[PDB]
Design a protein around this ligand. Structure first.
Ligand SMILES: [Mg+2]
Ligand SMILES: [Mg+2]
Length: 466
């Protein structure tokens, strides 16, 4: 039965989609330690989003499953008779799930604590992390897109997926030949609008492009939207997530009867504030719950914020340098051999990252026997599951195969990089596998990945749901 599987995987790795690609494929029985399959296991390869596996493990190790994140509002002193304060600080400590709703709830707390007037300015404080918004080797053309959002300790998360540092742009067609209507969402009044888009004739081609040109906080909309087209919605990043948070909080204050007379900007709580008055605060859900939308949907901002939070925890430095060393140390401390790990970020977006398939499976084995194994396991996309919060990036892969409902694995993709690594829960024993592909010139080898993962599921005794 073992030689059957090995022959089968060997035949899967023959697929012409892996023409000129390197592939790290390792399968280990986690109960025995038996190496079921190993090809190019020690080879160093970009992991893409599989880097999140290391980040998630480390974050659970360093911060704990029960770790939560805080945001607060501070004035130099409490409001008096007149209910007045001077300057006001919204302070973010790295909550990657901070919503506009949470901002409104804090705005109400500010109101209810007796503030009627912010006579000075409103400042957005994200100094808990450094102001290095983007990893060096990340590509500037990626910057407009949600997965490349700027990293800040104070950032507003959009939606139930908590996509950080973005706004939702809605483009609605008007009459043919009239400008399309562009609604900027949260960044209305914050980001700049450059709407050059038109409504094309009904039945015409949709050529709508929504950009944020590099180094601006302008949403540039170009192209044409057909008169009869459904509205278009896209997540677009903004410059300075904290300042958008500031802007949104300003509106939340005005909405809860708090008049803000000054300006909204970045600034940190001054050193010379002896006893800052916390007028509002908010506590995130615990990391174990945050791990779900992070890992299911592969949230890049979450990963990076978690690296900086690790940096803060191990070193009081909300920093990639410190956080990445913190990941490496936490992984070593877990028994993981990190010899082949090059860490350049937490998300796996950076092309400076390296792993080996051996390292991943090493990690999977180590994570499996950890006190947080289950929260870690629960965060992983489950093959073929319809519920996006269950199936995540594997929602529409391996449906109607033995893998459906059983294989828990993290996906990874970008140009010339693809990865699938996780567990195949066995009525035999729990298998761990890592499939990392670099180089392939055409379609990502998702069917190869699925083929292996399906074969492993069958091998572990599973059968396709019908
Ligand atoms: Mg606004
Ligand atoms: Mg099943």
């Amino acid at each position: 039965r073992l030689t059957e599987l090995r022959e089968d995987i060997d035949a899967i790795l023959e697929d012409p989609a892996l023409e000129g690609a390197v592939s790290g494929v390792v399968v280990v029985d986690t109960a025995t330690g038996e190496e079921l399959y190993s090809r190019d296991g020690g080879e160093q390869l970009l992991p893409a989003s599989n880097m999140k596996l290391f980040t998630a493990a480390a974050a659970l190790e360093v911060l704990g499953a029960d770790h939560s994140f805080g945001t607060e509002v501070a004035a130099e002193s409490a409001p008096g008779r007149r209910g007045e304060v001077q300057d006001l600080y919204l302070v973010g400590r790295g909550d990657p799930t901070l919503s506009a709703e949470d901002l409104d709830a804090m705005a109400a707390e500010v109101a209810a604590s007796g503030v009627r007037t912010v006579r000075g300015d409103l400042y957005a404080d994200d100094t808990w992390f450094d102001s290095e918004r983007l990893v060096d080797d990340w590509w500037p053309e990626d910057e407009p897109y949600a997965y490349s959002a700027q990293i800040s300790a104070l950032t507003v998360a959009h939606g139930e997926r908590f996509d950080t540092g973005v706004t939702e742009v809605s483009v609605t067609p008007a009459a043919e030949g009239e400008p399309a209507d562009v609604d900027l969402g949260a960044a209305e009044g914050y980001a700049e609008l450059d709407n050059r888009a038109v409504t094309g004739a009904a039945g015409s081609a949709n050529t709508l492009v929504i950009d944020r040109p590099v180094g601006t906080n302008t949403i540039a909309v170009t192209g044409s939207l057909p008169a009869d087209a459904a509205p278009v919605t896209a997540l677009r990043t903004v410059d300075e997530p904290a300042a958008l948070a500031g802007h949104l909080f300003e509106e939340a204050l005005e909405s809860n009867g708090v008049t803000v007379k000054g300006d909204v900007g970045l600034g940190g709580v001054p050193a010379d504030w002896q006893d800052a008055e916390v007028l509002a605060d908010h506590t995130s859900a615990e990391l174990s719950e945050i791990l779900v939308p992070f890992m299911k949907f592969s949230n890049n901002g979450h990963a990076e914020m978690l690296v900086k939070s690790i940096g803060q925890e191990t070193a009081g430095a909300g920093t990639w340098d410190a956080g990445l060393v913190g990941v490496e140390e936490a992984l070593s401390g877990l028994g993981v051999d990190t010899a082949g790990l090059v860490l350049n970020d937490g998300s796996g977006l950076s092309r400076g990252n390296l792993v080996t398939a051996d390292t991943v499976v090493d990690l999977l084995g180590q994570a499996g026997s950890a006190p947080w194994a289950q929260t870690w396991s629960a965060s992983l996309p489950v093959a073929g599951e319809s519920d996006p919060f269950v199936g995540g990036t594997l929602a529409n892969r391996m449906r109607g195969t033995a893998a459906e409902g059983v294989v828990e694995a993290k996906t990874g993709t970008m140009s010339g990089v693809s990865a699938l690594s996780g567990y195949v829960p066995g009525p035999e024993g729990e298998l761990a596998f890592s499939i990392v592909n670099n180089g392939h010139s055409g379609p990502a080898p998702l069917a190869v990945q699925d083929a292996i993962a399906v074969r492993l599921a069958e091998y572990a005794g599973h059968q396709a749901p019908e």
